[PDB]
Structures are given as C-alpha cells and as structure tokens.
C-alpha cells in the first residue's frame, strides 16, 4: 500500500548487481591483517611471518622513530594504560558522534 | 616496488608504456630461538645496540635482525641503562669485557 522507490526503480530496468566480496570474507581479511600485524611485526609483508613478542616489536618501532628502546621497558605499563584509554576514547567517539 | 625489501630497479622500454624489473630481497630459511629483552649483570641492565638477544638453549648470543650470525655478548655492542628490577623477562648471564684480558697480561 506504500510503494517505495526501490520497486519503482526496479520496474524500469535499473538493477543493482551484488558485489563479489561480501562482508564475511572482508572481515576475514581484516582479521588476518590484524593477526599478522600483532604476531609478526612487519616481516610478513616482505617474506614469511616470523614470531616476535609484542614488547620487543614496540621496542623496534621506538628505535625506528628515534627513541632508544630503554625508554619503553621502564615505562611499559604507562604505554599499555595510555593505549587502552585511547581505544576506549575512540570507541566513545564513534558511539556518540555520527558525523 | 616489488614484494620484499627493495634493492634496485631496471626500466625497459615497451609499446605505449614502461616495464620495470624490481630486484628484491626475500628471506628463505627460518629457525626457532628463545629470546629475552635484556641481560642482567652486576645489578645493571644491558641492551642490544643494533641487534637482538637470542639463545640456543645453552649460550646467549647477539645477532643482527635479518641474518643469523652469532656474536659474544660484550660491552662494545651493548649500552647500559637502569637496573634489573624494572624490565620484565630479563635473564641472568655474564657480560664479557675485552679490557680485562688486556689488563691481565
Ligand atoms: C617453531 O616451533 C613451533 C612450535 O611447535 C613449530 O610449529 C615450528 O614449526 C617451529 N619452527 C619454525 C621455523 O617456526
Ligand atoms: C638472577 O640472580 C639474582 C641473584 O644474583 C636472583 O635473585 C634472580 O632471581 C636471578 N634471576 C632469575 C631469572 O632467576
């Protein structure tokens, strides 16, 4: 009794094809990328994946940006607290603001 | 440019375009090791300068990141910072000093 525009545009030949990649396997790709970038560092993007503990990988990233790795290991809990608070803040930012 | 760490590139002419040859570096054969973030000796902490601490199970070696060559832990390739009570997972081993056998003789 209340016709929407989808049926009206469907009855004039304007169809919409479905995408080949649905959201399940896109989510599988993102899960694989997250698992690689946590448990392998940046080695999996060049050759094969190698296991590295996460604190040593963060020490490598700090040595990359210009801070020697003794600053990390004496301040690891502060880094973890700030990271958890940042993830919670960005979750609240996506929950509140819709723009 | 290519899959892996990059070394060079060679262009080649083509009809209506260009063809590249990205020579690249790929590691091949792997080996498991047991690591530790630092080495405790005399109450102070030793860290790798440019490398990583590995162990085969009996001895501890310092090794560069993308190729396996073992080296003895010395004061020349390590720098000291802090104590042993703030790092997590530190193991106990000696630290060699090259000045001691020179002063002994
Ligand atoms: C290292 O140990 C794991 C655990 O069993 C094993 O699956 C793997 O084949 C070993 N070797 C390499 C190169 O990862
Ligand atoms: C290293 O030696 C100290 C005493 O020299 C000891 O208290 C400590 O537990 C040792 N480390 C480990 C991992 O056992």
Our count of helices of chain A gives 5
Helix content of chain A: 55-70%
Largest interface: A-B, 15 and 21 residues
Strand tally of chain A is 0
Cα(first) to Cα(last) distance of chain A is 34 Å
Estimated structural class of chain A? mainly alpha
State the oligomer. part of a larger assembly
Q: Which sequence of SSEs, written as H and E, runs from N to C of chain A?
A: HHHHH
Radius of gyration of chain A: 23 Å
Biggest sheet character of chain A: none
The outline of chain A comes out as: elongated
Distinct ligand kinds: 2-acetamido-2-deoxy-beta-D-glucopyranose
Organism (chain B): Severe acute respiratory syndrome coronavirus 2 (2019-nCoV)
Disulfide bonds (chain B): 40-84
Protein name (chain B): Spike protein S2'
Glycosylation sites (chain B): 32, 56, 92
Task: Describe how the helices and strands are arranged.
This is part of a larger assembly, with 2 copies of chain A.
Chain A: H1 5-10, H2 23-39, H3 54-65, H4 70-73, H5 76-96
The complex binds 2-acetamido-2-deoxy-beta-D-glucopyranose (2 copies).
Disulfide bonds (chain B): 40-84
Protein name (chain B): Spike protein S2'
Glycosylation sites (chain B): 32, 56, 92
Attribute tags:
2 chains; part of a larger assembly; mainly alpha; binds 2-acetamido-2-deoxy-beta-D-glucopyranose; 99 residues
């Amino acid at each position: 009794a209340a016709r929407d525009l989808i049926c009206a545009q469907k009855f004039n030949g304007l169809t919409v094809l479905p995408p080949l990649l649905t959201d399940e396997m896109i989510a599988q790709y993102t899960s694989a990328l997250l698992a690689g970038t946590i448990t392998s560092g940046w080695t999996f993007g060049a050759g094969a994946a190698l296991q590295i503990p996460f604190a040593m990988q963060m020490a490598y990233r700090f040595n990359g940006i210009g801070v020697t790795q003794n600053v990390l290991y004496e301040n690891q809990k502060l880094i973890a607290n700030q990271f958890n608070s940042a993830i919670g803040k960005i979750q609240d930012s996506l929950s509140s603001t819709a723009s | 440019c290519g899959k892996g760490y990059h070394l060079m590139s060679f262009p080649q002419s083509a009809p209506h375009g260009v063809v590249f040859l990205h020579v690249t570096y790929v590691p091949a054969q792997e080996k498991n090791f047991t690591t530790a973030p630092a080495i405790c000796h005399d109450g102070k902490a030793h860290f790798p300068r440019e490398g990583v601490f590995v162990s085969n199970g009996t001895h501890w070696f310092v090794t560069q990141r993308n190729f396996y060559e073992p080296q003895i832990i010395t004061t020349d390739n390590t720098f000291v910072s802090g104590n042993c009570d703030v790092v997590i997972g530190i193991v106990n081993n000696t630290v060699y000093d090259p000045l001691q056998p020179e002063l002994d003789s």
